[PDB]
Paper text:
Proper operation of the pivotal CME cargo adaptor AP2 requires membrane-localized Fer/Cip4 homology domain-only proteins (FCHO). The AP2 complex, composed of α, β2, μ2, and σ2 subunits, is pivotal to mammalian CCV formation, and its deletion is embryonically lethal in mice. FCHO1 and FCHO2 are similar in overall domain arrangement —folded N-terminal acidic phospholipid-binding homodimerization F-BAR domains and C-terminal folded μ-homology domains (μHD) separated by a ~300-residue, low-complexity intrinsically disordered protein linker, which has been suggested to participate in AP2 activation, although how it does so is undetermined. We dissect the network of interactions between the FCHO interdomain linker and AP2, which concentrates, orients, tethers, and partially destabilizes closed AP2 at the plasma membrane.
Since FCHO destabilizes the closed conformation of AP2, TGN38 YxxΦ cargo peptide (DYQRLN) was added in the hope of stabilizing an open form of AP2 in complex with FCHO2 linker. The resulting crystals diffracted to a resolution of ~3.3 Å in space group P21. The structure was solved by MR using the bowl of the open AP2 and Cμ2 as sequential search models and demonstrated that AP2 was in the open conformation. The N1 and N3 blocks of any given linker bind to different AP2 molecules. N1 binds to the N terminus of Cμ2, and N3 binds to the C terminus of β2 from a different AP2. The weaker electron density following N1, which “points” at the start of an N3 attached to the β2 subunit of an adjacent AP2 molecule in the crystal, is the start of N2. Hence, the FCHO linkers appear to cross-link adjacent AP2s and thus provide a major crystal lattice packing interaction. These data both confirm the locations of the N1 and N3 binding sites and suggest that if N1 and N3 are simultaneously bound as anchor points, then the closed conformer becomes destabilized.
Numbering used by the authors:
A (entry chain CCC): 235 to 243
B (entry chain SSS): 1 to 142
C (entry chain BBB): 13 to 584
D (entry chain GGG): 357 to 388
E (entry chain AAA): 9 to 621
F (entry chain PPP): 1 to 6
G (entry chain MMM): 1 to 135, 144 to 219, 252 to 446
H (entry chain DDD): 318 to 341
Write the structure that this text describes.
């Protein structure tokens, strides 16, 4: 899997 | 009442399977595998619902996480769409601008954010206040 | 969503970064994502000298361009400018692809080069043109100049190169599915002597086209029909099915030469068995197709696999669908000689765990019994043990055999209903509630109980099989004529329901006809309802004489699989 | 759920009164 | 901050293989097994961390065959976060036997009963999260007592309110109604609204049957909206989520009022109807948020509010003005807001005081059946055409659904078929229409023509003397189509059976001509279809004794007389005796006109109603 | 294993 | 003909999908995943009509490969196409699974369009696809005329430093035999898998014991099949690289390399006592290897106990069957296994429904009695011959379905 | 695979020609 982050903006 | 709420990253790993129902392991994989199929095709110009056997799904995709609620047929639509968004926006405070990578490192921590906002098949607690309080107070002292 | 990220990527000034954009557009197309939007941005990449890209712009073009006819014009000048390229592999790709775009303006700009290409120096192009004509015919089926591409097509058959004439024949049979008045055409002594002769040099696939073609043809004299089969026989091998069966399909049609008539006919019946068997050795899918084809071929000509029967003994780790066919075939092959080992295998079979196997396998004894008198006494033995095991779904299936056995060996096995009614436990399978009711029917004089039995089933009428309904109607007016004293209150009900409730027009008509007979003349009523019915025939649950002959003329096809004429698979 | 078996066939003559039939037909008239 | 976890789980997100997780997890199933059995004992972190690796592996799909009772230890614990991982491991796994089922539920009994707002939040929740029979039976009489408003703290009456619905749903028998009723409606008048949202639910699903009893606090639903909207701008900061004043809770109330009719108190219909025109006037002020979360929840209510408005059906002010309201969501840009304005406009269409208006929104829907395109968005638009259809609408509304039918998705068709069937017959000025449309229904579907639809095209035709002769001709003419559908033959076979004589005249449909053509389908049909034809044959052997020649020679045929199928023979034999042994007066009296079908329930509507759920 | 031939 | 062509993973997710006819839409690709891969009831066939759309398929590793069509197509021709396709793939990117699918996803599409035009199988032949699909004018004009010719097996000329070739007479021995020891069915189905490293357009001719007498034998495309139906010459210009030149079936005089001998005797109600015995059956110099002996168990199987006098067994509930492995076993030997099984009476009282004893095994002879009498070579232009051609012949016999009722 | 006009062959049996024979 890869790097995932942020459910905003 | 709700049949279940799922989450699934675009890639189709199960990152929250809640069962208020006497489903079988062959009929749990199938609907997890299935829900994904119906949901990970639909853009922003289709209805965020859709029938699903003798029930229906409510869902929204927040960049790269597929939140779904298989609800009853007569259970309110735009009212269960928010129940995700206002369930999201409590994850938003508790994990501090939440992602996917938290929902795994903290995989035993959104069950408590769940059981709080929903239980048995129906909603239970819908203040971003009394929620975030019963969480962090349950934590800070053990 | 993440769809602009792409439009972006598809413009980036490094051509390799654009490429790897499309690659992601293809992937997204594959898994549903309606990238319908990006059309023009893909089309800006199609005027490129790098093929491995051009190719993937086409895979895209093909899909969306029917639902984008407006914009899809963007593409046309690039296409026509490929159908002229000095590289034939580029030409074939251009034309191959442009044929697949379905919007009438593009259809028109297409006719220009698809004329060129049907006449192209290169055969790999002509191979393509030939195909591109069936594609065309699937829209603008008229196109008058394209009534004059049927011209171009036909003539490709003569063409030197075998891959052209394979796609010629292939294309041209499918075009020939519009047959209002003056169609098929073809089919002459010049033609066939090319085809059959090319039936060697054409590929694997070309072979299945030509054979599936000829099977259409009728010959006249026997001198001819033989001299054909001598050139089809050699198809004994490879597409370890397709070609073989398609040659069986022909060879089976070309068998009007009367039973013994010739040394040939009693040799072509000899040739047909070995390569038929061999299909069972192939992979489990073709095993199936060829098991389903045997099961037809057994009925037309039971002379071919007459002996061979050992070849159908089901094995525990055969794939269920191969077993189910192997069983039903052995039963057709069951003879005065080999009910011995058949009955033996049948009882191996009925201890399996697949329920619809075990069943078909016991049903298979009754079918056997009914077919081979000598067995009946011993065949009926087998059903005791099986019943005595007390496995409900076996009993339920046996009652269904036991009934039809009575009807062929008219009760000299009464004893068994006592036995099997004390192994029953429950009777939930309607297939088999029917057979209980009808036995209690026929023999209501010999069942002191019968009026209980048939009362029991009136409790739940609507919500029983419109078979357990029709079968009970008759089983209670049968009882009534037989014990009218003590019954009337049942035909009161039954006939009531069948007349005054049922939404089923046809069970209402049956519920009148009885009510009318009884009411108008009871002497006729009895002599109609209880009239002596002949014995059922030893057959092996068969197929209708011409419905067969139609299928036999469909032996490679999906028809031979489903055992149902085309008209249960829709027009396009 | 009850269940039963079958006697053997008779050979000759103890017959069935048509009057029994006609009587029992006469009586029956049908329901909703 | 467990490192046993954050090490082990950091290995699996660093992985780049599916059979490499089969290494790293099956090392961690061979790791934890060494822990409990053999070597010393470690508690606190060691029974907490070497279990949280077994709840995390069972959400990656691998076998928890070695490890459970390790965690049936954490249940009767001291801390809050040493039980939590035990009541999320008898919530995701009720054990493999009935072994621990008596050891689980006395490490629950001691925790419910221990007066505690923390250790009742784990112990009543688990009964509402599992909903087992053992977990139900023994804690039946218990739950009524807790809930009674009084002594047990606020956010525990939640955990009982929604454990007595779970249990009343799993085990309704072990929940009959005592007098904890009157104190539970008392909860509606609460300060803690998390309890009211948990109790407004429980008052519904139980007293779904009878709110007449619970009615009282019915009215006082209003008070917690109208005084947080009509006057001030951005009201009490409690739940002011995207400017909508506490939404996911006024849906639960308007949805308890939808159980049994409008309120009888003339003041409580004067307070409710005032409040209804607060929500019809929250949606007569424009978007004070551009992002979609607002209109959602403003309408999440406004819909459930409309959902009641209809259910009342009593206020033709709030009916024909709420349908003009849903007739401004049809053309709206969102597909959700159009979709729901077809889900709900649906319901109105059949209420006298609303229909005439609804009916006059039609073309919008037709030309939205002929638009959006995503099965579901158009699908729901049929359901509306189908509801709005009366004698006016029909001919258009039929030919329209007929159009949809072809193109439309295999997975229903019948759905549409059943509808067209029902409509056609229910609104036919001329019945020569009814026949033509049911025949279309057989050309276009046929494979989806149902059972009961082709029953009813006969029932009706042997009730109408004007059509008989027409049916006969039209049906006849359908059957010389060389590739006709089975269900044509099942119909056309019974139709000429009764009315073939009204076409005998025509020289291209003489009784020889007719019979010969039915027998052209006989060999190509299902037993049952053949069984019918045999009746149509022996009927013909009365209508026309011209052909009693041929029809007998068919019935005698080995094929028919010796058939393996019971009826197919039962009949062939019977029919032959009649043909031979039965007077002429007796045969003609017996094969009479066949009586008209009595007016009745129409079992088509009964099957559409059985397609749902 | 493989054995040479003619 | 062939309408669509769809590959999926174990999860019902799409990997490649190429539609060749308007006949067919998303509708279908969806209506398989639903009706076949997520289907509740599993008892089925490889062909499947749904709403007058037909749905052929195959599985490999964890993969589904479906053909779709709205026609009365040549059913065989499809499955055989499905197979030749799967060969093409594995023989381009090794192993047919989700990784190697997604990794060559272009190479696939690129191939799917070349191998299939408008649903008509074109040129499935890997030995030609590799002249112009990559993992001058007279230079294309060849690469085409070759593709469309009569040969499509052989790139022209391209040749080896020494002319060489290998022949694997692989065989698989099928048996059904009652618990007495009576051969009900038994046949050998074998195949002769060349490996032509010859040079040019080498003509060839192949003999064996064509009179052991063969019950029937089917060829590859490369054998001149009318020359075979006049004389009995197996004449063929062969593919380069490995390729399957003929399959044959043999029913009579069969070296059945193992007699299972089962002996069960339940000791009352609860104790079950099972004794299987092997008897190897060939030259004792030779040794059979990779010997498995699946001994199936009751369904009321409490007990897991075994003592084996050779090899190494290991009971498997879920399998509900003992699996007993012998490293090697020489010809004309014996060997036992023993077991003691505990019966907790599950349902009412069905007398347990005993499968047979199935056996996998390799042995290094041709159980058919088939032997390769010769293999002629000839290239008239470039002059080499036998007496500068290497040759080779192996002989391997697996099981197949080696069932023995118990 | 190619290298310089000739084709290659995967193996570690190694070359074995006539093997103690003649051309007599």
């Amino acid at each position: 899997k890869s790097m995932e982050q942020k459910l905003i903006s | 009442m709700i049949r279940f709420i799922l989450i699934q990253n675009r890639a189709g790993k199960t990152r929250l399977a809640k069962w208020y129902m006497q489903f079988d392991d062959d009929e749990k994989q199938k609907l997890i595998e299935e829900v994904h199929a119906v949901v990970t095709v639909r853009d922003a110009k289709h209805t965020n619902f859709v029938e699903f056997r003798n029930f229906k799904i409510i869902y929204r995709r927040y960049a790269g996480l597929y939140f779904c609620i298989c609800v009853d047929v007569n259970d309110n639509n735009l009212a269960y769409l928010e129940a995700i968004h206002n369930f999201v926006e409590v994850l938003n405070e508790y994990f501090h601008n939440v992602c996917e990578l938290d929902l795994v490192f903290n995989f035993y921590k959104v069950y408590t954010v769940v059981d709080e906002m929903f239980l048995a098949g129906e909603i239970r607690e819908t203040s971003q206040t009394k929620v975030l309080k019963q969480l962090l107070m349950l934590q800070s002292l053990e | 969503g993440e769809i602009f990220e792409l439009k972006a990527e598809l413009n980036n000034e490094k051509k390799e970064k654009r490429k790897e954009a499309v690659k992601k557009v293809i992937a997204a197309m594959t898994v549903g994502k309606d990238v319908s939007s990006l059309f023009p941005d893909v089309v800006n990449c199609m005027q490129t000298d790098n093929l491995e890209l051009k190719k993937l712009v086409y895979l895209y073009l093909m899909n969306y361009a029917k639902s984008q006819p407006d914009m899809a014009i963007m593409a046309v000048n690039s296409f026509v400018k490929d159908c002229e390229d000095p590289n034939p592999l580029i030409r074939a790709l251009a034309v191959r692809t442009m044929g697949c775009i379905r919007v009438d303006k593009i259809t028109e700009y297409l006719c220009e080069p698809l004329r060129k290409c049907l006449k192209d120096e290169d055969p790999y192009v002509r191979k393509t043109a030939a195909v591109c004509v069936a594609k065309l015919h699937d829209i603008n089926a008229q196109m008058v100049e394209d009534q004059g591409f049927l011209d171009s097509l036909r003539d490709l058959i003569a063409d030197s190169n075998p891959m052209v004439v394979a796609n010629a024949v292939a294309a041209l049979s499918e075009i020939s599915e519009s047959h209002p008045n003056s169609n098929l055409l073809d089919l002459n002594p010049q033609n066939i002597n090319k085809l059959l002769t090319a039936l060697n040099e054409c590929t694997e696939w070309g072979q299945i086209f030509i054979l599936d073609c000829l099977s259409n043809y009728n010959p006249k004299d026997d001198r001819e029909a033989q001299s054909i089969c001598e050139r089809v026989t050699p198809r004994l091998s490879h597409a370890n099915s397709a070609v073989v069966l398609s040659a069986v399909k022909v060879l089976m049609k070309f068998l009007e030469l009367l039973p013994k008539d010739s040394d040939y006919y009693n040799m072509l019946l000899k040739k047909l068995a070995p390569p038929l068997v061999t299909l069972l050795s192939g992979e489990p899918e073709v095993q199936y197709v060829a098991l389903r084809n045997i099961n037809l071929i057994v009925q037309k000509r039971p002379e071919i696999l007459k002996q061979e029967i050992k070849v159908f003994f089901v094995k525990y780790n055969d794939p269920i669908y191969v077993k189910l066919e192997k069983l039903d075939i052995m039963i057709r092959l069951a003879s005065q000689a080999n009910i011995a080992q058949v009955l033996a295998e049948l009882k191996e079979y009925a201890t399996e765990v697949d329920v619809d196997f075990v069943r078909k396998a016991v049903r298979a004894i009754g079918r056997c019994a009914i077919k081979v008198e000598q067995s009946a006494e011993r065949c009926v033995s087998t059903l005791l043990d099986l019943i005595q095991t007390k496995v409900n779904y076996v009993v339920q299936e046996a009652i269904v055999v036991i009934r039809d056995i009575f009807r062929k060996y008219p009760n000299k096995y009464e004893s068994i209903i006592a036995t099997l009614c004390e192994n029953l436990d429950s009777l939930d399978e309607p297939d088999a509630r029917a057979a209980m009711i009808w036995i209690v029917g026929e023999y209501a004089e010999r069942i002191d109980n019968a009026d209980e039995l048939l009362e029991s089933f009136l409790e739940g009428f609507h919500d029983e099989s419109t078979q357990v309904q029709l079968t009970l109607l008759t089983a209670i007016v049968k009882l009534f004529l037989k014990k009218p004293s003590e019954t009337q209150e049942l035909v009161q009900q039954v006939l009531s329901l069948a007349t005054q409730d049922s939404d089923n027009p046809d069970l209402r008509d049956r519920g009148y006809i009885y009510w009318r007979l009884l009411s108008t003349d009871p002497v006729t009523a009895k002599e109609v309802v209880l009239s002596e019915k002949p014995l059922i025939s030893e057959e092996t649950d068969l197929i209708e004489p011409t419905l067969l002959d139609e299928l036999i003329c469909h032996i490679g096809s999906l028809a031979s699989v489903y055992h149902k004429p085309p008209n249960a698979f829709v027009e396009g | 759920i009850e269940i039963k078996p079958m006697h053997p066939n008779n050979s000759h003559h103890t017959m069935a009164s048509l009057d029994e039939l006609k009587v029992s037909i006469g009586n029956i008239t049908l329901s909703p | 901050g467990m490192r046993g976890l954050a090490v082990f789980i950091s290995d699996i997100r660093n992985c780049k293989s599916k059979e490499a997780e089969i290494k790293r997890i099956n090392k961690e199933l061979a790791n934890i097994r060494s822990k409990f059995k053999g070597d010393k004992a470690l508690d606190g972190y060691s029974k907490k961390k070497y279990v949280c690796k077994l709840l995390f592996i069972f959400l990656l799909g691998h076998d928890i065959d070695f490890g459970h009772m390790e965690a049936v230890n954490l249940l009767s614990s001291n801390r809050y976060t040493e039980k939590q991982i035990g009541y999320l491991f008898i919530s995701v796994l009720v054990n493999s036997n009935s072994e621990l089922i008596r050891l689980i539920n006395n490490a629950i009994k001691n925790d419910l009963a221990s007066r505690n707002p923390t250790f009742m939040g784990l112990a009543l929740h688990c009964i509402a999260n599992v909903g087992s029979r053992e977990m139900a039976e023994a804690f039946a009489g218990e739950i009524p007592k807790i809930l009674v408003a009084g002594d047990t703290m606020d956010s525990v009456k939640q955990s009982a309110a929604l454990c007595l619905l779970r249990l009343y749903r799993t085990s309704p028998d072990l929940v009959p109604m005592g007098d904890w009723t009157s104190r539970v409606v008392h909860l509606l008048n609460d300060q803690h609204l998390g309890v009211v949202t948990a109790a407004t639910s429980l008052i519904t699903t139980l007293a779904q049957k009878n709110p007449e009893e619970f009615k009282t606090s019915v009215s006082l639903a209003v008070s917690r909206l109208s005084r947080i909207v009509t006057s001030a701008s951005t009201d009490l900061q409690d739940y002011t989520y995207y400017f909508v004043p506490a939404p996911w809770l006024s849906v639960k109330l308007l949805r308890l009022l939808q159980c049994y009719p409008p309120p009888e108190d003339p003041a409580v219909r004067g307070r409710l109807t005032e409040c209804l025109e607060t929500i019809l006037n929250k949606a007569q002020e424009p978007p004070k948020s551009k992002k979609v979360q607002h209109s959602n929840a403003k309408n999440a209510v406004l819909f459930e509010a409309i959902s009641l408005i209809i259910h009342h059906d009593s206020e033709p002010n709030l009916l024909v003005r709420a349908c003009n309201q849903l007739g401004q969501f049809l053309q709206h840009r969102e597909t959700n807001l159009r979709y729901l304005a077809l889900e709900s406009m649906c319901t109105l269409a059949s209420s006298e005081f609303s229909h005439e208006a609804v009916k006059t929104h039609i073309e919008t829907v037709i030309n939205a059946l002929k638009t959006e395109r995503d099965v579901s968005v158009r699908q729901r638009a049929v359901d509306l055409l189908y509801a709005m259809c009366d004698r006016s609408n029909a001919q258009q509304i039929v030919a329209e659904m007929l159009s949809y039918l072809e193109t439309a998705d295999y997975s229903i068709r019948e759905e549409i078929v059943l509808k067209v069937a029902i409509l056609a017959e229910k609104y036919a000025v001329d019945y020569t229409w009814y026949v033509d449309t049911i025949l279309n229904l057989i050309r276009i579907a046929g494979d989806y023509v149902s059972e009961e639809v082709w029953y009813r095209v006969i029932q009706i035709v042997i009730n109408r003397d004007d059509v008989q002769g027409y049916a006969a001709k039209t049906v006849f003419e359908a059957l010389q189509a060389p590739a006709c559908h089975e269900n044509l033959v099942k119909v056309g076979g019974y139709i000429l059976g009764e009315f073939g004589n009204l076409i005998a005249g025509d020289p291209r449909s003489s009784p020889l001509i007719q019979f010969n053509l039915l027998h052209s389908k006989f060999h190509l049909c299902s037993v049952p279809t053949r069984a019918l034809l045999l009746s149509t044959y022996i009927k013909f052997v009365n209508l026309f004794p011209e052909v009693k020649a041929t029809i007998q020679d068919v019935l005698r045929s080995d094929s028919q007389l010796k058939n393996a199928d019971v009826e197919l023979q039962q009949r062939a034999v019977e029919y032959l005796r009649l043909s031979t042994v039965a007077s002429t007066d007796i045969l003609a009296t017996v094969l009479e006109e066949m009586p008209p079908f009595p007016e009745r329930e129409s079992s088509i509507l009964a099957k559409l109603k059985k397609k749902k759920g | 294993d493989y054995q040479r031939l003619n």
